[PDB]
Symmetry: D2
Subunit: 257 residues, 4 copies
């Protein structure tokens, strides 16, 4: 029941970080994966290590024409389409009173609009092929608890979750499932950037900010991309066949719902 053999997957933002771990895990579980990413060279590198082969395609998830074209190219390459993991996201950090319109839009356009477009287009394909498709979106701990210095980011990730819920309600009568995962403090390049921004803004060392994240975590350690990826495999699989519209926390006990 956890097997993804034969399934055809697209992972947006799959070149690096959590997305790459998702792609690797989906593949380990039996799927054939297309990675759509701003960095198509990094996508090809990930594909090189997948067991079932795969495909790399360039996409800018902020732009409808790009997402439409990327998705169609991936679907054509895969020879079908069963699963979307919409993972592309960004952050900037800033005191709320100083957030710029530019970075409000950067966060919204990638995190919320990028999920919208990939999801909307995915569902169009699923419906046109009468597929029991499955969507997993990457939200955040900040889709559950507003985070200081990330107020715009939090807003954008709450938007993901709300979109997820509503979409799920529309797609469930069509046997299309839509869920999201809410990671905690994940060791990737987004975290390494964040610790340095945060330390500066709070006047702390990077090391102390890190240690605070671990102190907040009941399981006692910083999170890895794989911690999230293995949960996305679950939500993609038929073990989760009676689950839709959820924001599954994968945070080590930080956030309980």
């Amino acid at each position: 029941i956890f097997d993804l053999s034969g399934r055809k997957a697209i992972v947006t933002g799959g070149s690096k970080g959590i997305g790459a771990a998702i792609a690797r895990a989906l593949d380990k579980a039996g799927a054939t994966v297309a990675i759509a990413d701003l960095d198509v060279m990094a996508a090809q590198a990930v594909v090189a290590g997948l067991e079932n082969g795969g495909f790399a395609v360039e996409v800018d998830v902020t732009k409808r024409a790009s997402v439409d074209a990327a998705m169609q190219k991936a679907i054509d390459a895969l020879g079908g389409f069963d699963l979307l993991c919409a993972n592309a996201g960004v952050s900037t950090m800033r005191p709320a009173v100083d957030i710029t319109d530019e970075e409000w839009d950067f966060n919204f356009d990638v995190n919320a609009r990028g999920v919208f477009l990939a999801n909307q287009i995915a569902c169009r394909h699923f419906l046109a092929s009468n597929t029991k498709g499955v969507i997993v979106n990457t939200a955040s701990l900040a889709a559950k608890v507003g985070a200081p210095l990330l107020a715009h980011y939090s807003a954008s990730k709450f938007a993901v979750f709300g979109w997820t819920q509503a979409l799920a309600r529309e797609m469930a009568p069509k046997n299309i499932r839509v869920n999201c995962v809410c990671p905690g403090f994940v060791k990737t390049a987004m975290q390494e950037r964040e610790i340095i921004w945060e330390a500066e803004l709070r006047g702390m060392t990077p090391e102390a900010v890190r240690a605070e994240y671990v102190s907040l975590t009941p399981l006692g350690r910083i999170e890895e991309p794989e911690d999230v990826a293995d949960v996305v495999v679950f939500l993609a699989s038929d073990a989760a066949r009676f689950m839709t519209g959820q924001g599954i926390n994968v945070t080590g006990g930080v956030r309980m719902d």
Copy 2:
């Protein structure tokens, strides 16, 4: 104690519906109100009825320069500034697969960006004047439960709530409180449009749709703007002095948190 005597309030989207009720209720409680709205003449008519006088100013909450200018004009007119109720909002209704970018941006730019802008600018003012300012944002039941045919609207209202939480956390050390309210099925012009849109989309009469809303409401009646307004007064007031970052449900029992 629920008195707002001597407090200086700005209500965005106060010309009509919930915002007009909020303006009347704040004024009944002792505040002097400035209404900032697209519809300046309707705002002026609400102001005409208020006990403590007040001011009406044109604003388009989607635009930073407009919000900056309208807030400054209001604060100048009021002679101070203690309370922002950011209420302006819009909706469209569409199957998720058919949502346009135009209507995605219309919902986000008013609902989410407009709150952002009014709040951020309010907080700059409060901090510059050393005022223990208070914010009440109007979210929605759709900030708690994703609603079908309103997937983009829901996402935008989730974003309000996430923004509210994160700002509350930043503002709390400054003794500035930020909360939102989440109304249910409130009988305003927006309800009248939605009833019609939903009737159109589901092949029902608008009256049957409205009756279904009441059937879904434990307290057994359609909601009034005043149902909401009296809770905004509470949240504005010092009775709510130890409450910040909440999404207070005012739905007649439809949603419980």
Copy 3:
């Protein structure tokens, strides 16, 4: 609309702390208050200072016969019954692996059973008289987030919240509202004592424990009973007429729902 003039209230556990503050606030707002408490001398001490008179009655909220008789005596004394504030509660702090059955039962029977009996009997009274009755139960932050060292306490307070929601659903069609309040870190005369015990269990000093509670509170201070009581006034009043089944956080930003 926030006035309780003419209303007749019963407060269980009104002798001390949050309950005493509730009784004093209800009275200030216009109500006539009966306090039902295990310590009737301490109840009478609170009644002595109230503006609108009132009545003190012995009760053991763990026993149905006691609650029925106290409630009946109180209603008789008041000449009516509009409002129940079910506040009686207890806690013991213990590592989860060392919780005794006695401590489990103590917590459940007072906190969860006590609310059940008082609420059930109140509702029987309201329904028999066709009264638009209101209930405010005192839950806890630990009804929202389970708390280490308070695992049985948390379970009991989650139960209060679930009870509140279900009862509210049943009662709403009969024009009876049922809400709860979820206080945070409240300074009562008992907390000197429960802080030393926590400090002992955690290998900290009492000072360090109290300071940590402040640190953890966005609004920057320990909570007072009055912070809660004023929100209870609101929930009792017709300002909250369109709210039912809620767990209203009064935590200074610690918990956001």
Copy 4:
């Protein structure tokens, strides 16, 4: 990462319904399972069919002496102990004003106390043997939303979730995870019973009550035990290694968190 090969499990309430499906699914995934149930005849019948051996033991989860003896007997039979699924539960349906003390106690003693005892004793064992132990408790949709006619049942299931969260926070530093699953409208004998009671209390047919549950489920069918059991497998597994303190909805989209 989803394999439970070699692991030793105890399922309380595993004789029929959801519990039996849990016990089957854990076994299919590679575990050896002991079932502890009030009906040991039925438990033995399930155990007889398991691939990996197993053990049936009689338990009354409402009694500490019973739980301690049954768990020790199981652990001795299994030769180790890695996993507890505390599933035993009961319900009765009754209007909230008519709930008896006897049925309040029945619901609490099984549902909440029985999880407390099983979990507490399990953790004692895990800690003594330095075991990375895992607990999955069976809560309910009614741990998330209070259910009319089930107010006592809801309160007991809220308790299970709150216990789960608090215990998770205490156990997380010791490498022990504690989660719960919240099933929706699952077709078992609890449902066949309830459909009848509810139909009588509401003046409806049993068929119509069941139809109403389907109507309320976005995925559009009544839930099966296996829908729940497969998620339990996931939570038991190392795929869920960075998840603790959660109430995972398995409701077909009825409740989203």
